[PDB]
Amino acid sequence: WGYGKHNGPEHWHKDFPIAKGERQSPVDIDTHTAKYDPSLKPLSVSYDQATSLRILNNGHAFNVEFDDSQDKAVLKGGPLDGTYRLIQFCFHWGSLDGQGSEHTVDKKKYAAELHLVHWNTKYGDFGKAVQQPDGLAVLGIFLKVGSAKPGLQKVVDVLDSIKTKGKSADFTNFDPRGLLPESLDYWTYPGSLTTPPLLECVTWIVLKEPISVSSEQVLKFRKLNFNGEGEPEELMVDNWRPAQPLKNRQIKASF
């Protein structure tokens, strides 16, 4: 799989039948239909003690990994039951500023989308959680083009180092707090991973408020390669999956 014309999103179903399941993500957030739910508690993001390890080019996106052996970077509250540990974050972006996000708001597409992946500590490890309906919590943050985002510059500058498929680089002392909007208002619904194996174990939490990034920050993302070093150059852009059918599910609002 990939995002090309012959191994793209519309082909995943062949290898990953759950592709056309009942709680697939991403979806379009119809703000007029979303239900304001008063029983929704505020989000609780404890990342002050986070420990980054590294960044790698997995051939479909780039990941910043975290040490999740202890409750260092956690997410709780909201619609969540128990503690969820930060394991990684990655992005989805497009060829142009008019495309790239996965989730859409009233059919509007953002320049990119940031996913903070967390797993339920009740299940002991990541691999056991992706076997549960409430195994993961993904924090989704939209990126619009405007002013630079200081907190993102550290990621931006190490891209050169992992241009191709399979590369990785040490990436310690990286504070994710630098990537959060001012507001923690959100939308929530039950869905899945947005990439194969597309397991339907995620509780999505899409922040309302987008973060702005400059044109040259986003530009550095478009310089990445899907291919491995020594193979024809195929730029890493449009690594986003198209909106899926809601199918009865309901999207709730904390505001």
Task: Say what the resolution is, in angstroms.
Answer: 2.3
Helix (H) or strand (E) holding 218: helix 215-221
* Nearby residues of 231 by Cβ (< 8 Å), 6 or more positions away: none
Whichever domain contains 240, its CATH number is: 3.10.200.10
Q: Experimentally, how was this structure solved?
A: X-ray
- Quote the number of domains for the chain: 1
Tokens in use for 248? 């009865």
Which residues constitute the domain of residue 173? 1-255
Handedness of CA 38, 78, 186, 196 (dihedral sign): negative
Is residue 133 within 8 Å of residue 200, measured between CB atoms?
Answer: yes
Is residue 195 within 8 Å of residue 206, measured between CB atoms?
Answer: no
Helix (H) or strand (E) holding 153: helix 153-158
Catalytic site positions: 60
Write down the residue that tokens 């899409």 correspond to. 206
| Residue 129, number of CB atoms within 10 A of its CB | 24
| Residue 233, number of CB atoms within 10 A of its CB | 9
